[PDB]
Amino acid sequence: NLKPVDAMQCFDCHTQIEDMHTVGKHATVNCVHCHDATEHVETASSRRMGERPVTRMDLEACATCHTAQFNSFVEVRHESHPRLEKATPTSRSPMFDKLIAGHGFAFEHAEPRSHAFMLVDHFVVDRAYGGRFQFKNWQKVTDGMGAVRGAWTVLTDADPESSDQRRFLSQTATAANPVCLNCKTQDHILDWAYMGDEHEAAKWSRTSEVVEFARDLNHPLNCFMCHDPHSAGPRVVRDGLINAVVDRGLGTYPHDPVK
Amino acid sequence: NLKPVDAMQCFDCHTQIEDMHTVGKHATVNCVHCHDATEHVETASSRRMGERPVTRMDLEACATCHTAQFNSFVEVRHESHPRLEKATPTSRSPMFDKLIAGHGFAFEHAEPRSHAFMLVDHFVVDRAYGGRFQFKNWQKVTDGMGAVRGAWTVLTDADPESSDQRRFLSQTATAANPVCLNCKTQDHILDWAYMGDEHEAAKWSRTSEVVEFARDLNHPLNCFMCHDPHSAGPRVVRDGLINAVVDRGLGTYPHDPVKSEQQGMTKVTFQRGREDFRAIGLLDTADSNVMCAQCHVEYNCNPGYQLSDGSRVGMDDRRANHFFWANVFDYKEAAQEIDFFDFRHATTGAALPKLQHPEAETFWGSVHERNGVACADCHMPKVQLENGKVYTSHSQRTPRDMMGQACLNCHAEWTEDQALYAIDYIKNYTHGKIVKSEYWLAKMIDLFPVAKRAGVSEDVLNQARELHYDAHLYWEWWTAENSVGFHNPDQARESLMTSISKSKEAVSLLNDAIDAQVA
Amino acid sequence: NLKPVDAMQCFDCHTQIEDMHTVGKHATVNCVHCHDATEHVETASSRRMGERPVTRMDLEACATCHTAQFNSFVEVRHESHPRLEKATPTSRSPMFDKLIAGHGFAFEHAEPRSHAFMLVDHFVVDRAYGGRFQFKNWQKVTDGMGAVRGAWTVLTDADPESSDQRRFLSQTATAANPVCLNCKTQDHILDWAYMGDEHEAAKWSRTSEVVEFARDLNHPLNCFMCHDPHSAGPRVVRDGLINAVVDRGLGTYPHDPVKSEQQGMTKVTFQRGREDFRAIGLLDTADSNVMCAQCHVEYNCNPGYQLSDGSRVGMDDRRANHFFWANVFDYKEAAQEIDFFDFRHATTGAALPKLQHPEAETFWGSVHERNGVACADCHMPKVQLENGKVYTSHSQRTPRDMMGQACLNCHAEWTEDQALYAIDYIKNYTHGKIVKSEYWLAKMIDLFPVAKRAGVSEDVLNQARELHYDAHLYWEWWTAENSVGFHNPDQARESLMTSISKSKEAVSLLNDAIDAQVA
């Protein structure tokens, strides 16, 4: 059973968090729901992290108090046809192969399906990782809950001993790169500097070995991508969006300054 | 927005709560979710309450973090026909008026409907408060969420300026008393001493003015009736049940000492000053049989009379709040044990028991109960989801609505139609015997005036009255009990055959006696 | 093909029709659609009819230009169970035979079915014509369009050679009389003087031989019963209703003089020679409450007896065609006003009223009626079409078949299931009280033979008989009325509780009196 920690102790060093957490609708939600910080508290200073606390990125961290939202999220819409190639006469772009020739999407571009599968679909699509990653078998394609629990619970890696992008299957491509993952997961939110710029504090960046990065990532569309875990208030986390709206001053509605 | 309080400061004076809260699955749930204790904390000592802190009893206090359970609970089953009188040819007891004559249930006894409505239905039924309380208008009958938000949001009081029980409509009764409310709400959980005994710290007791008590209550079937708010662990709160199981040593399963020990109850008492005040029963396991038995039992919750001498047993008597905790074949002995009956039949003059929905005591010893099946398995099963986090449905309803989860997962050999057919075979058979039992009770009853007027002796009439007690018990158990025999078909069959046997015996006695007077 | 006639020539002698026809929405509809007047025109003067012109009464006269209304009208609702006897445990009045004993309804009283069948059902019911008229075979019962085409297309007469009312089957009665037909057809609209009084120009009257009258009638619920054929404007034609509203000054809404003035009726009389003959009631608005009240009312349409002295009141008396136009609580006074009762109970000897389907008088004062809702809003709503010309459904049936239009457009807060649930709550509750009312009436009734045979005094029996009148009225209103309380739930509840109160009073009176004689 979870045991609450003294948030005041955290707040001594985490003023930003204090300001957000104490005011919003998660003011009663103890840190222990998402962080295991005991060794961190023992070793940190005001300015140095010490041992890194564990932070839960799994969506089930939110599901214990928000089961309805979680269950609604992970539902699979079976009517949303899976792995359905767009470059066919009965889909969106009958002449796509001729028109896109020269681009990696020629190797495969399926219609989207339910959000639960976003990370696993990114990993297994033929254009992404040379066919390196596959569902463990063809039954696993149904398993939205499983994918949500973690990509690596339902996928395999053709060669755990190498980290290079290469073709394992002939008609694949290796288009995936670290930036892609920012629209599939935010498991890396504490390990990726704004925009993926090189940064001494970031394990991952735009120039990382994407196969290594992939193996560190588990969950699709984290609940906290739209909801600050501390304030519970609405937000975005995606760097590129913040860059457009704020850094470049274009606004949330570039056509409408008032809105 | 809620602001958390320093629970550790609370715990300097609340070690009992500390020991429950810090250990269970609510250790991280701050007191502010359910208590407003700011002025309390300013004024209390460890030996003096100071200002009374506010405790939330509303179900929404739990819905914030447990919406799926809340929403499943408050769902209205529209197919559970509302305000459907049982004393009609198409319901449970076609001859109920004749058989129950002299009891308040003659004024109205509807079939149960969804749990959301339990407190409002208790308030508005014609037998309870003389028609004092009514829905604000006939539209409000649909409003289960409103009822849950609070009774007084959907009801009116015909006379806010008086608090006496009286008839506002001609064909009503005023049977409600404070004990009733314990099976409708536990909003009064901090204001009611164990068993409703008089107590210095209790605002309400068995002897309170029930109309006044009613006005202070709002919510049905509080979530905390089955779940301790501090530990989150399984419990009961109903005093009568704790009294039977623990105080009287009967156990959770009177017919099975082993199961009673494995699935037991620990009585926990809370004091006011130095005196015991209230109690709960912590369960060894999340045992729905015992949770549901807080209400779905045969009970006293009313005044009555002594079998020994006919004298009145009033609400002030402990016997007015009593769980018999006895199966049908042990009930008469149980009632003799406390020297109690409910009413005298208006026609026969027999002292009779009034039975109420003895599901728990009926389920004992049944094939399902012996196989470790519990109420929740059929009536509030786990939800089955293609993709999702499992939770327990809190929509307590007939398994017909969820047969896959309620029956067919266990009965792999059956289709849904086969399972339904098996239920219907029992219910159909049981109902036939209920109807026959009523036919023979009615036949006996109708002979009483004839016998009396023919000059049949009191000795003979009393012999017949003794038969009536048994004929009644062995019948009414089954019109009271909601499964129409499904919970225990062999017991229903034996009981109903016994009723008929007793009635037949009385019919013969009376007919022979009348004929002798003629002759 | 129809050839139009010169209507202007008609109008040289028919100024009354001219003034209606030239102004309304049938100004362009030539007389030839409904009248064959060729020989009439050849032989008439303004003061002498000459040859009688033929007037079409068949509904197809209107269907030619109004097929959608016609087709909606003639639709058969198969879910409205046919020939379903009310005196059964699963219908409206489980104890009707005991309670109604002495009245002709004991021979048969079925639930209503679709309007198409009203005339044929009137003809073939066991209580009406001694079994004289029957469907040609049991297949014809389905044939609503055939019934509308004409009764005698689907029925047979057991003896075309006699015209007396007699029993052809053993367990029938001969209650039918000419007044009945006015709520089944208006084929006789030109052959029947106002109120069915004797009149030189009337072929038919209250005193006619009903079998002869029957043979001349064909069509049910003529379209012109609600719509003047000449102006197309809203009206009533039923004499009894015009008599209550206008002649007796009661108004269209007796309980609301303002609404009565806004939604009133103008009596228009038509003469034969110099004498008033027939009348219609032109409505200020297309008010379905009053249109439907042509038939869905409590009425006299039968002989009976005087309350004052017990003497016979025959069909020749004006009282044999009477709309009481009174709610349940005003009815007894209304009946005293005309010094009338229907029958003496076969067991109790009490003078009793016979009540019939008082929907109009029940709906008065109800929440819906007070909010300006009318029968048509729930029972014949406008059709909702994704693309099309709106028209009014003429299929008068339960709103359960069209809940979106009948209820949910107004009750936006409800789903269909919620709305149905609200209806069922009322009906279930009301039915329970009907059943209880019957239980207590039956209990009283059964004491009469016992009391009589015990030598209870006539004074006491008469006191009980006076109670019986009231106990009966306050019960039977609700088995007669078709909504099972929905049209006015609070009134139903008060009435039924009153019935029970009265029966209980009589039961006590009689039991005490019997016991005194013994003891």
Ligand code: HEC
């Ligand atoms: C220990 C229970 C608990 C946990 C764990 C939890 N929440 Fe909450 N959350 C709450 C409570 C309590 C509220 C306030 C409910 C209310 O008052 O409406 C809330 C409110 C919210 C709101 C509404 C905020 C607003 O301003 O309207 C959002 C969004 C939310 N939580 C998201 C999340 C996310 C995403 C997670 C996982 C990172 C999470 N919660 C985890 C308890 C919890």
Ligand code: HEC
């Ligand atoms: C008589 C048993 C049986 C039958 C019938 C059956 N399956 Fe299977 N199926 C299996 C087994 C065993 C596996 C392998 C399970 C494993 O090893 O993980 C499997 C595997 C599969 C796979 C994965 C194949 C792959 O290449 O990885 C799919 C998809 C599947 N089944 C679908 C179906 C479908 C759809 C049907 C009905 C048309 C069907 N199965 C009928 C037993 C069966």
Ligand code: HEC
């Ligand atoms: C700006 C956010 C964003 C980025 C970055 C991103 N995607 Fe996507 N991706 C989406 C969205 C939104 C969809 C669903 C809509 C669609 O497919 O049109 C999607 C769908 C997909 C799918 C499922 C449909 C398909 O095309 O087969 C795959 C696979 C995928 N992305 C792979 C990738 C790869 C590989 C990269 C990096 C080269 C990438 N994504 C980068 C937003 C993103």
Ligand code: HEC
């Ligand atoms: C200085 C000691 C003290 C402190 C600190 C304290 N309490 Fe209490 N509390 C009491 C006493 C004494 C009573 C009354 C016990 C009795 O009836 O004998 C009481 C009673 C209560 C009750 C029951 C009231 C009732 O209706 O009977 C609640 C609930 C409660 N406290 C909550 C809290 C909360 C929550 C906190 C921390 C926010 C808190 N208390 C802090 C002393 C304290």
Ligand code: HEC
């Ligand atoms: C601030 C959020 C919150 C509030 C408010 C809340 N709960 Fe909980 N509850 C939790 C959390 C967190 C858990 C543990 C979830 C887990 O880890 O499985 C829990 C667990 C439970 C359990 C499971 C306990 C067990 O031992 O299996 C029950 C039952 C429960 N809560 C009932 C309630 C009741 C009843 C209320 C209202 C009196 C309530 N909760 C209010 C957050 C809350």
Ligand code: HEC
């Ligand atoms: C031991 C718990 C318990 C007590 C005490 C209790 N009830 Fe109930 N009551 C129930 C249960 C369980 C049901 C649902 C099952 C049923 O109606 O058979 C119910 C149903 C009802 C209903 C709805 C059905 C009906 O009979 O119309 C009403 C009204 C009601 N009770 C009124 C009362 C009154 C009045 C009292 C006190 C005289 C009372 N209850 C005391 C357990 C209880």
Ligand code: HEC
């Ligand atoms: C009549 C007793 C009873 C009532 C009242 C009750 N529950 Fe439960 N609750 C149960 C049972 C039984 C379980 C399942 C226990 C098991 O099988 O482990 C349960 C389980 C739970 C759980 C654990 C997670 C799950 O779904 O299994 C939570 C949280 C919970 N209930 C919340 C609530 C809420 C919130 C309310 C008020 C809306 C409520 N309960 C009222 C009996 C009850």
Ligand code: HEC
């Ligand atoms: C093995 C499955 C099973 C168990 C366990 C079970 N019931 Fe039932 N119960 C039924 C069935 C079947 C019915 C009849 C439902 C029907 O015909 O729709 C029923 C009927 C009921 C009803 C009336 C429901 C209705 O809408 O007519 C109530 C109340 C009830 N049970 C309570 C309980 C209680 C309380 C327990 C535990 C003491 C219990 N049941 C255990 C199967 C079960």
Ligand code: HEC
């Ligand atoms: C030759 C065609 C024709 C015949 C036959 C006919 N109608 Fe009409 N009716 C009309 C026309 C045209 C209107 C006016 C349509 C409009 O302009 O709205 C009308 C309008 C009506 C209206 C609407 C009146 C109003 O004021 O709103 C009613 C009601 C009506 N007719 C009833 C009948 C009845 C009843 C019959 C049979 C006795 C009948 N009609 C026969 C053509 C006909």
Ligand code: HEC
């Ligand atoms: C094999 C041919 C056949 C079968 C099958 C059949 N019928 Fe008939 N039915 C007839 C005939 C022929 C008549 C008499 C027709 C006539 O003489 O007008 C008749 C007459 C009837 C009658 C009138 C009976 C009467 O006494 O007036 C009814 C009602 C009827 N059928 C209903 C049904 C029903 C319902 C079914 C199916 C359960 C059925 N029929 C099956 C041929 C059949």
Ligand code: HEC
């Ligand atoms: C004031 C109008 C009116 C009069 C006059 C009238 N009825 Fe009716 N009748 C109705 C209405 C309205 C219904 C449908 C509602 C109902 O049956 O409750 C009906 C229904 C019927 C039915 C079908 C249901 C049943 O009772 O079997 C028959 C048959 C019937 N009447 C026969 C008669 C007889 C015979 C007479 C004369 C003794 C008569 N009616 C006089 C209005 C009338």
Ligand code: HEC
């Ligand atoms: C019991 C009274 C009644 C009867 C009989 C009747 N109607 Fe109507 N009729 C109505 C009502 C009510 C309306 C709608 C009036 C309103 O709301 O404006 C109506 C409307 C109409 C209209 C106007 C257009 C429309 O649909 O709104 C026509 C045309 C019409 N009826 C034709 C007929 C026909 C043809 C018949 C015979 C099949 C018939 N009516 C019988 C009551 C009646």
Ligand code: HEC
């Ligand atoms: C506010 C809507 C409403 C109004 C207005 C209304 N009724 Fe009803 N009526 C109902 C409902 C609901 C029933 C019950 C139908 C059911 O349970 O299927 C009913 C039942 C009936 C029935 C029996 C129908 C059946 O098939 O059982 C008749 C006849 C009837 N009403 C006539 C009328 C008359 C005549 C008027 C105007 C004086 C009227 N109603 C006004 C709602 C209405």
Ligand code: HEC
């Ligand atoms: C034309 C609008 C309209 C129609 C159609 C309508 N209602 Fe109503 N209904 C009302 C209004 C207005 C009220 C009173 C609302 C208030 O004052 O709170 C009401 C009240 C009620 C009530 C409460 C009655 C009481 O006595 O307290 C019920 C039940 C009801 N409606 C059900 C229905 C049903 C079921 C239908 C369809 C058969 C129906 N209504 C159709 C407008 C309508």
Ligand SMILES: O=N[O-]
């Ligand atoms: O009346 N509830 O047992």
Ligand SMILES: O=N[O-]
């Ligand atoms: O029998 N029709 O009132």
